[PDB]
Write a protein that binds this ligand. Structure first.
Ligand SMILES: CCCCCCCCCCCCCCCCCC(=O)OC[C@H](CO[C@@H]1O[C@H](CO[C@H]2O[C@H](CO)[C@H](O)[C@H](O)[C@H]2O)[C@H](O)[C@H](O)[C@H]1O)OC(=O)CCCCCCCCCCCCCCCCC
Ligand code: CLA
Ligand code: CLA
Ligand code: CLA
Ligand code: CLA
Ligand SMILES: CCCCCCCCCCCCCCCCCC(=O)OC[C@H](CO[C@@H]1O[C@H](CO)[C@H](O)[C@H](O)[C@H]1O)OC(=O)CCCCCCCCCCCCCCCCC
Ligand SMILES: CCCCCCCCCCCCCCCCCC(=O)OC[C@H](CO[C@@H]1O[C@H](CO)[C@H](O)[C@H](O)[C@H]1O)OC(=O)CCCCCCCCCCCCCCCCC
Ligand SMILES: CCCCCCCCCCCCCCCC(=O)OC[C@H](COP(=O)(O)OC[C@@H](O)CO)OC(=O)CCCCCCCCCCCCCCC
Ligand SMILES: CC1=C(/C=C/C(C)=C/C=C/C(C)=C/C=C/C=C(C)/C=C/C=C(C)/C=C/C2=C(C)CCCC2(C)C)C(C)(C)CCC1
Ligand SMILES: CC1=C(/C=C/C(C)=C/C=C/C(C)=C/C=C/C=C(C)/C=C/C=C(C)/C=C/C2=C(C)CCCC2(C)C)C(C)(C)CCC1
Ligand SMILES: CCCCCCCCCCCCO[C@@H]1O[C@H](CO)[C@@H](O[C@H]2O[C@H](CO)[C@@H](O)[C@H](O)[C@H]2O)[C@H](O)[C@H]1O
Ligand SMILES: CCCCCCCS[C@@H]1O[C@H](CO)[C@@H](O)[C@H](O)[C@H]1O
Ligand SMILES: CCCCCCCS[C@@H]1O[C@H](CO)[C@@H](O)[C@H](O)[C@H]1O
Ligand SMILES: [Cl-]
Ligand SMILES: [Mg+2]
Lengths: 34, 32, 79, 39, 65, 39, 504, 164, 37, 342, 30, 34
């Protein structure tokens, strides 16, 4: 299928950028003193 | 005779070196 | 635990021994070349032995397992 | 006979160095004469 | 630590940590086998390399000579 | 049958064993005559 | 805290979680195999094992399934070009499915072993500390490896209970999966004899069973236990990495030179078959036998199988690629469609001329034609002002025998020169360059890519061996040397024997 | 491109100042690895098994962080005793001097080939009894140099010698 | 579950972040031309 | 009653002028034969039958042009043992066939193994961590990839490097013309590690020498150091401030500094070895496909990348007939690529 | 798109230089 | 220029995946009790 060639990078960054943001925030919450 | 490791190591290098240098010296007088 | 080299090579005994052995080794190496023996031990061409008089082609080895006999043939074609 | 320093090290070094110079000088001479001289 | 049915069965097989035979033990016999193994590897290397050439062993895709 | 290269293989093998055997026999002999002294 | 390059050292004293991590690694590798096979099946064209076999299509795991007897698809085709075959469950798809399911089961087992790490099995009954009896584990695992090795050889490879293995003729024309009997004579050590592969697995398997039993029953000598640090699991990592880089060099070598386990219908021809003109000699042998039997030249060359001519073409040589020229060979010269036939070049006097072939070393190569004695008779000049051998001056023509162009003769110099440029590559083919938008630049085959990856990984694993071997033998100084290191233990003259305080 | 043309026009590989340059950078890399490994080898134990050994040194501490006598004891046995530095000032002067002098000579190589005093030319230096040239590896270098020479700046020369 | 005593905190200091990002970005600057080809 | 193995261990590890060790049993014969083989071959042995080349002092070569050259391409990857099927025990023929090349390569390989083992053995006896051995893995990776893996991927040992000064220069230019090796990012990382290592060597030595504390009265400052002293001989604090203000960053940790001096050249050599492993298979970084598509369609498009390929094409065409004599190349004058006039 | 990629990576490197120098971990004597 | 269409996603993930790994580790180190 003749799909848009930017669809792959668009989808990849759409997932990765906000997911990474949340993982960064989660891990540094876990590492805080309990 | 008393030979040591150092003595042996020295001469394994030094003895061929002098022989080779005499060979290479002689080669300087070979003409084609 | 061994004597320092500087003590050894500044001693008379060291130089009595090596005033003979060093020149002797030098002369033996000289003769190894000047007698031509070096050519025949190692198989190195003399200046007149790279080419036969008529051909101007390299005696390149082309046969792995009969290379020894191939060199022996290239050499017989010289004289 | 085996005592160190009977022959001063400065003389050993000078003669040995002159020997090195002579033999290396011979090799440079051979670059201009006989085999390898291009001539 | 938690015991389990399968763990109780496997217990003997993990029971002799640190146990050794005295001294050199079977090291001499091991050295012999290592020596034989080295010669074996040298043989198969030299066959593959055509340094060792054997009757009826044509190291080629083709089986002729 | 024993081909020339198999004969060569045995020659190389025996040659290597001789080199190694002589080396260790000598080293062992030297180490036995020239032992370290311990308290 | 732990630096980033040491995070996994938390497993060293935790056998249950080490097992969990090993389970997870095993799940990932099995899942890779399954997903790789599915991707290949979604991209593989099975319609032409002659001019579009798997090794032209960038297939990497398909040849390993085929090597051991998986050759059919549930959709009805086989890799030897058959139709209407029933492979049963163990088709390419069934293999992929099994690996995916295995992956999930291993993933679940990893979770269980991670949570329930504190099993009594992993504790030394005397000390209560975590303890693995690595010498006995070695015997247990060696015995199991020997049994599997033996059974693989005795049942699978023989066909006694299993499919056999891929075998073929010396020119890779008629390959198929066959049962193979073991070869117990010296030719079993011939890498090109498949019977030696069968005998190896039978004999090494038996040896592995015997050595396994020895290693189950006989404790290590105290001298070796101490010297190899057999209480330290990192010693096992060191020597295992060594064995693995040894194996990796071996599989790189047999892939590059060829053996009975790297057949050319699965991985493509070798570079040495081009170097030695292996296929060209066989083609000429057949042509000459046809001619000696009264065939015409057209008949003699028309009897040459397309598959044989295709091996005699440098675009299939694995030493013609590039590190960043990615994908299938078809992406370069195109999807091969048909042999054009054998080009015979002649000059105006009618003498047959031969195009000098390109060696693998050369990205580009001149066009030079010689007679049967090697005398130059024509070429394509660079500077024209002093040209003596141009196709125009020499009246070079080209005639084709066999293939698409059988019986045709070309005399137009640009056309003759165009075919001469293809002849430096060997036999000449027509390609579909449109379907994949091929760029005309040669790529290597899976034979090349396999060899590269495994030689590189092998060399890198040498560093891993050295590193973990050092950490094993120097564990006591890994955090630094004793703060009050005796100056007499490292200076000269104090100790007779280096590192021995009792020889002061 | 600069390097390849330079080789055809000056035979820089056969120039002894470029050779000294190579010894400078090969030797500098070697001595960096050597010095780095010897100091790292003899760090004094100041950390636990968890943390990086780098925490065993504190910026500005007065005491040395490794045992230079241990380091010297290793290296003097690796080669022989008197081949090893026990003087840290001598050692670090050598580390400075070797690559610096090597690169000085490299720079002087380019700066004197700039005036066309070029690398050694042994093209056809070996001749047999009749007068045939017997090629050496120097002659194989010359064939590569010629290939570069005839191809470079392929539209720029009208006359037979490339004199600059 | 009972706590696993083999756990350890992990650390990456700021200098190591800067060194690592430099390594990654420069490797990317180097290899990107070959990825685009 | 001690046991012969321990008595031998005692003697091997005696503190003597030249340490021997168990590792010396491998190291000393193999290093000596590799070095002795090279001196023997470069002094006396020809390359006439393998290469069509003179290669020894005896023939008239000098130190820059002598070599021990690879065997003829027709030997393949033969181990070329003296007693093997090619020389059949004939020492003279063995030399003429190139046996000294595999002699030197293989004794050299096992000698390098012996040396790394020596590094481990001495470190263990003296009680230091074996980082010197670990750093030496880089020379080993280079030797193994260049002198063993690379020819093993090619047609024969013939295309390995020959052991000589000019022979090695020829190897460099061959790799440019045939592999475009300068374009390879693994070679580029190697270059960075070597030049970066030399940079670290110079800057660290210079920094120490110019932040010394005055620990004596002499204007020559080497005497003001004592190996047993506890104190740093130079100021880390002043060095750190200097480079922070000059360059923007500076070392502050002496341990990291010295590990980094190992890491950089060792990693660079390891990367170059990986690229050569690719070149064993002709898996080159030879071209940029997008550049070739554009230049083929647009005869006004030119870059330094296309300019260097023209040089490579010149190298291949003009050096191959004499450099690959087993191919019997005859390239008529008219087919040789060349620009105007030259 | 390839020019953007190259210039983007370069720009990230220059930014890293800025943070590595002016927002470094301060060297502290202890 | 006719570049490889996967070059963009390859470069983006080559940068992003290891850079994010390091950012995660750094931030959770900073947040640990001092
Ligand atoms: C880090 C470690 C620390 C340091 C360690 C140093 C230790 C040094 C000792 C090791 C020496 C190994 C020598 C290997 C010789 C070799 O390979 O010799 C080559 C031979 C193969 O022979 C070659 O085979 C070719 C292909 O021929 C085949 O195909 C032809 C064309 O059809 C013909 O049909 C022919 O009959 C058929 O045999 C050509 O004939 C060549 O001329 C011939 O030399 O393989 C063989 O002996 C054996 C091949 C399998 C084993 C390979 C393992 C070792 C090498 C790993 C690296 C592989 C490199 C791949 C490139 C990347
Ligand atoms: C459960 C049984 C099982 C079976 C029947 C298969 C079957 C298959 N696998 Mg799968 N696989 C499995 C489990 C299994 N797998 C597991 C658990 C994993 C995760 C590790 C994988 C991961 C995997 C990958 C990554 C691949 C396969 C592939 C394949 C196919 C080719 C096999 C091959 O070439 O092996 C070759 C096996 C060897 C060469 C054996 C090496 C043995 C070493 C040398 C022994 C060394 C140590 C030993 C103890 C030494 C002493 C021995 C002693 C006897 C003397 C075949 C369909 C290939 C495929 O086609 O995928 C689609 C493929 O690429 N599998
Ligand atoms: C043993 C490993 C291996 C091998 C030999 C192959 C071989 C093959 N693959 Mg497969 N593949 C593999 C693993 C492998 N694969 C894995 C793990 C995946 C999941 C990602 C895949 C997914 C895959 C897909 C999707 C495709 C292939 C395809 C192919 C074929 C084309 C190969 C190619 O173009 O590579 C190109 C190779 C390179 C460009 C070299 C990369 C070099 C890297 C970037 C160097 C990195 C250096 C590093 C950053 C330096 C660090 C320095 C630091 C330490 C200081 C070939 C048969 C293609 C095909 O034709 O399928 C039909 C295809 O489309 N493979
Ligand atoms: C079976 C093989 C094997 C195993 C089980 C180990 C296991 C270990 N290694 Mg060793 N090592 C190996 C092979 C192996 N290594 C090889 C081949 C090399 C040379 C490349 C090394 C070089 C090495 C060094 C220099 C060090 C270790 C260390 C360690 C310990 C900590 C690892 C860690 O936390 O990394 C964590 C790793 C990360 C968080 C990210 C790494 C990302 C890599 C660089 C790129 C991505 C790889 C990719 C995901 C998968 C490719 C798989 C396949 C193609 C190989 C652990 C015991 C360390 C140690 O001794 O601690 C005390 C240590 O300093 N290893
Ligand atoms: C450290 C010592 C050492 C090592 C590792 C090597 C290694 C090598 N040598 Mg060199 N060599 C050495 C010292 C060494 N050499 C010395 C001191 C000399 C001067 C005498 C030479 C003179 C020399 C020459 C002239 C040549 C070599 C060659 C070689 C290569 C081929 C060797 C071979 O095939 O041996 C095969 C032999 C062995 C491997 C012996 C192994 C013995 C086994 C282990 C015994 C096993 C016994 C078993 C347990 C008993 C079972 C009994 C049964 C009934 C149960 C190899 C690289 C050849 C070469 O380089 O060609 C290019 C070559 O021509 N060497
Ligand atoms: C205790 C033992 C102490 C000694 C141990 C020695 C072991 C290692 C020896 C290595 C020597 C390597 C150089 C030999 C050069 C030679 O003999 O040339 C011998 C040649 C002979 O000269 C040639 O002879 C021919 C004869 O047919 C022709 O006449 C040629 O024209 C002519 O050039 O001399 C030269 O080339 C000029 C002098 C060149 C010297 C340069 C060496 C410097 C580079 C060394 C780099 C490595 C470091 C080695 C350190 C030692
Ligand atoms: C992992 C987590 C996520 C991270 C992803 C990171 C991606 C960046 C790294 C990928 C680099 C790939 C570069 C090529 C880009 C490309 O277009 O490839 C694309 C290729 C596929 O190739 C494509 O195929 C297509 C038809 O199927 C078409 O022909 C396309 O034209 C063609 O590009 O992908 C691969 O081949 C990947 C597998 C390669 C395995 C090679 C084995 C070599 C391994 C040795 C490396 C050792 C190095 C050690 C150094 C220390
Ligand atoms: C160039 C000639 C001098 C080369 C050595 C110094 C140059 C490198 C500087 C590195 C960066 C500064 C590094 C630095 O700071 O150095 C500092 C170091 C010690 O300084 P001091 O203050 O103790 O001594 C210098 C003066 O104060 C005099 O006491 O300087 C020296 O050791 C000078 C030695 C010169 C001895 C005479 C010259 C010897 C030349 C040997 C040449 C061999 C050539 C071989 C060619 C194949
Ligand atoms: C859970 C479960 C399940 C499921 C499962 C599954 C679905 C799985 C999957 C899996 C998978 C699907 C997997 C995959 C994997 C993959 C991988 C693991 C990959 C990797 C890669 C790599 C590692 C690479 C690298 C590289 C690159 C990237 C580039 C080039 C170079 C190299 C090669 C190095 C079931 C249902 C059964 C049920 C049970 C449970
Ligand atoms: C091979 C072989 C072998 C062995 C042999 C040997 C071991 C030998 C040795 C040899 C030797 C061991 C030789 C030596 C030589 C030397 C020389 C030839 C030298 C020269 C030198 C010079 C010339 C110097 C220079 C210089 C420098 C370098 C720097 C400073 C300055 C001067 C100038 C002084 C055997 C029998 C086992 C077997 C068969 C094969
Ligand atoms: C696409 C890119 C994907 C990249 C993914 C990378 C994942 C990286 C995972 C990092 C793992 C960090 O894991 C985290 O470690 C810290 C310690 O360092 C733990 O923290 C623990 O120790 C610290 C000690 O200072 C305590 O303050 C904290 O209370 C305690 O829970 C966290 O409980 C754990 O969640
Ligand atoms: C002007 C074209 C002359 C016709 C025959 C040319 C040689 S053959 C020609 O070669 C091409 C690759 O160059 C293939 O893509 C194509 O399929 C094939 O027909
Ligand atoms: C040369 C290979 C050496 C491998 C180690 C073999 C040790 S063998 C070991 O040696 C002792 C004396 O040292 C004897 O007392 C003992 O009985 C014997 O088994
Ligand atoms: Cl001009
Ligand atoms: Mg002369």
């Amino acid at each position: 299928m003749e799909v848009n060639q930017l669809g792959l990078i668009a989808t990849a960054l759409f997932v990765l950028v906000p997911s990474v943001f949340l993982i960064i925030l989660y891990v540094q919450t876990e590492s805080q003193q309990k | 005779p008393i030979f040591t490791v150092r003595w042996v190591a020295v001469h394994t290098l030094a003895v061929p070196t002098i022989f080779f240098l005499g060979a290479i010296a002689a080669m300087q007088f070979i003409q084609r | 635990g061994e004597r320092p080299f500087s003590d050894i090579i500044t001693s008379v005994r060291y130089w009595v021994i090596h005033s003979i052995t060093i020149p002797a080794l030098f002369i033996a190496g000289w003769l190894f070349v000047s007698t031509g023996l070096a050519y025949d031990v190692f198989g190195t061409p003399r200046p007149d032995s790279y080419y036969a008089q008529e051909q101007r082609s390299i005696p390149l080895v082309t046969d792995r397992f009969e290379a020894k006999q191939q060199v022996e043939t290239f050499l017989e074609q010289l004289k | 006979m085996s005592e160190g320093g009977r022959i001063p090290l400065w003389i050993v070094a000078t003669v040995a160095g002159m020997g090195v110079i002579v033999i290396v000088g011979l090799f440079f001479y051979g670059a201009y004469a006989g085999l390898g001289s291009s001539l | 630590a938690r015991r389990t049915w399968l763990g109780d069965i496997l217990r003997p097989l993990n029971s002799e940590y640190g146990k050794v035979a005295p001294g050199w033990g079977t090291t001499p016999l091991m050295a012999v086998f290592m020596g034989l193994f080295l010669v074996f590897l040298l043989i198969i290397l030299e066959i593959y390399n055509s340094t060792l050439i054997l009757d009826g062993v044509n190291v080629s895709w083709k089986a002729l000579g | 049958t024993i081909t020339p290269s198999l004969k060569g293989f045995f020659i190389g093998l025996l040659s290597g064993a001789v080199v190694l055997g002589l080396t260790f026999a000598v080293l062992i002999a030297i180490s036995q005559i020239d032992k370290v002294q311990r308290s | 805290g732990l630096p980033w390059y040491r995070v996994h050292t938390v497993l060293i004293n935790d056998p249950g979680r080490l097992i969990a991590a090993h389970l997870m690694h095993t799940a990932l590798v099995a899942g890779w195999a399954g997903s790789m096979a599915l991707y290949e099946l979604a991209t593989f064209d099975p319609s032409d094992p002659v001019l579009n076999p798997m090794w032209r299509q960038g297939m990497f795991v398909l040849p390993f399934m085929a090597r051991l007897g998986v050759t059919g698809s549930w959709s009805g085709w086989s890799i030897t070009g058959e139709t209407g075959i029933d492979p049963g469950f163990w088709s390419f798809e069934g293999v992929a499915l099994a690996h995916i399911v295995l992956s999930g089961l291993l993933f679940l087992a990893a979770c269980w072993h991670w949570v329930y790490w504190d099993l009594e099995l992993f504790r030394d009954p005397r000390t209560g500390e975590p303890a693995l009896d690595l010498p006995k584990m070695f015997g247990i695992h060696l015995f199991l490896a020997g049994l599997l090795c033996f059974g693989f050889g005795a049942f699978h490879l023989t066909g006694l209970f299993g499919p056999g293995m891929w075998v073929s003729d010396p020119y890779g024309l008629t390959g198929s999966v066959q049962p193979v009997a073991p070869e117990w004579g010296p030719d079993g050590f011939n890498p090109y004899n498949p019977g030696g592969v069968v005998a190896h697995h039978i004999a090494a398997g038996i040896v592995g069973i015997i050595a396994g039993l020895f290693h189950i029953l006989v404790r290590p000598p105290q001298r070796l236990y101490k010297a190899l640090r057999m209480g330290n699991i990192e010693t096992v990592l060191s020597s295992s990495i060594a064995a693995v880089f040894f194996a990796a060099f071996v599989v790189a070598g047999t892939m590059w030179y060829g053996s009975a386990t790297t057949p050319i219908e699965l991985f493509g021809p070798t570079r040495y078959q081009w170097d030695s003109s292996y296929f060209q000699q066989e083609i000429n042998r057949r042509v000459q036998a046809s001619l000696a039997s009264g065939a015409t030249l057209e008949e003699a060359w028309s009897a040459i199988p397309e598959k044989l001519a295709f091996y005699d073409y440098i675009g299939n040589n694995p030493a013609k690629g590039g590190l960043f020229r990615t994908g299938p060979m078809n992406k370069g010269d195109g999807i091969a469609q048909a042999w054009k036939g054998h080009a015979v070049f002649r000059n105006k006097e009618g003498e047959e001329l031969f195009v000098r072939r390109m060696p693998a070393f050369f990205e580009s190569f001149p066009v030079i034609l010689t007679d049967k004695n090697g005398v130059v008779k024509a070429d394509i000049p660079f500077r024209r002002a002093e040209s003596k051998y141009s196709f125009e001056q020499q009246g070079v023509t080209v005639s084709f025998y066999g293939g698409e162009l059988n019986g045709q003769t070309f005399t137009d110099p640009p056309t003759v020169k165009s075919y001469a440029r293809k002849a430096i590559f060997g036999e000449i083919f027509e390609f579909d360059t449109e379907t994949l938008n091929s760029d005309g630049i040669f790529r290597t085959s899976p034979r090349g890519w396999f060899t590269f990856a495994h030689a590189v990984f092998a060399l890198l694993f040498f560093f891993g061996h050295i590193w973990h071997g050092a950490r094993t033998l120097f564990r006591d100084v890994f955090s630094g040397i004793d703060p009050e290191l005796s100056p007499e233990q490292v200076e000269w003259g104090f100790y007779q024997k280096v590192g021995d305080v009792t020889t002061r | 491109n600069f390097m390849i043309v330079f080789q055809a026009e000056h035979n820089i590989l056969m120039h002894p100042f470029h050779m000294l340059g190579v010894a400078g950078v090969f030797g500098g890399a070697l001595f960096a690895a050597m010095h780095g490994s010897l100091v790292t080898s003899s760090l004094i134990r100041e950390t636990t098994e968890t943390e990086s050994t780098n925490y065993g040194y504190k910026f500005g501490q007065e005491e040395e962080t490794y045992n230079i006598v241990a380091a010297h004891g290793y290296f003097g046995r690796l080669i022989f005793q008197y081949a090893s530095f026990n003087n840290s000032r001598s050692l670090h002067f050598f580390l400075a001097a070797w690559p610096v002098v090597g690169i000085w000579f490299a720079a002087l190589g380019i700066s004197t080939m700039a005036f066309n005093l070029n690398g050694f030319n042994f093209n056809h230096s070996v001749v047999d009894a009749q007068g045939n040239v017997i090629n050496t590896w120097a002659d194989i270098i010359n064939r590569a140099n010629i290939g570069i020479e005839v191809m470079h700046e392929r539209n720029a020369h009208n006359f037979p010698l490339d004199l600059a | 579950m009972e706590p696993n005593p083999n756990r350890q905190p992990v650390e990456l200091n700021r200098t190591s972040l800067y060194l690592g990002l430099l390594l990654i970005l420069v490797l990317a600057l180097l290899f990107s031309s070959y990825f685009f080809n | 009653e001690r046991g012969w193995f321990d008595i031998l261990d005692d003697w091997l590890k005696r503190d003597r002028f030249v340490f021997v060790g168990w590792s010396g049993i491998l190291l000393f014969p193999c290093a000596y034969l590799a070095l002795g083989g090279w001196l023997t071959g470069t002094t006396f042995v020809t390359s006439w039958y393998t290469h069509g080349l003179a290669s020894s002092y005896l023939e008239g070569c000098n130190f820059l042009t002598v070599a021990v050259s690879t065997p003829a391409n027709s030997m393949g990857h033969s181990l070329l043992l003296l007693w093997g099927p090619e020389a059949q025990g004939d020492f003279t023929r063995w030399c003429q066939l190139g046996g000294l090349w595999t002699f030197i390569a293989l004794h050299g390989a096992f000698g390098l193994i012996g040396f790394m083992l020596r590094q481990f053995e001495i470190a263990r006896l003296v009680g230091v961590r074996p980082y010197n051995a670990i750093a030496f893995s880089a020379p080993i990776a280079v030797f193994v990839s260049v002198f063993l893996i690379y020819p093993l991927g090619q047609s024969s040992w013939f295309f390995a490097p020959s052991f000589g000064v000019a022979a090695i220069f020829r190897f460099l230019l061959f790799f440019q013309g045939f592999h475009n090796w300068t374009l390879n990012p693994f070679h580029m990382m190697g270059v960075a590690g070597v030049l970066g290592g030399a940079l670290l060597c110079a800057i660290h030595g210079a920094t120490v020498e110019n932040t010394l504390f005055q620990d004596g009265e002499g204007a020559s400052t080497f005497r003001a150091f004592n190996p047993t002293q506890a104190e740093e001989t130079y100021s880390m604090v002043t060095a750190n401030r200097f480079w922070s203000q000059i360059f923007g960053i500076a070392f502050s940790n002496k341990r990291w500094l010295h590990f980094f001096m190992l890491f950089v050249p060792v990693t660079g050599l390891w990367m170059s070895a990986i690229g050569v492993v690719g070149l064993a298979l002709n898996l080159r970084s030879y071209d940029f496909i997008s550049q070739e598509i554009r230049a083929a369609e647009d005869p006004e498009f030119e870059t330094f990348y296309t300019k260097n390929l023209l040089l490579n094409e010149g190298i291949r065409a003009w050096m191959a007939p004499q450099d690959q004599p087993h191919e019997n190349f005859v390239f008529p004058e008219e087919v040789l690529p060349r620009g105007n006039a030259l | 798109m390839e020019t953007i990629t190259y210039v983007f990576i370069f720009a990230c490197i220059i930014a890293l230089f800025f943070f590595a120098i002016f927002f470094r971990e301060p060297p502290r004597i202890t």
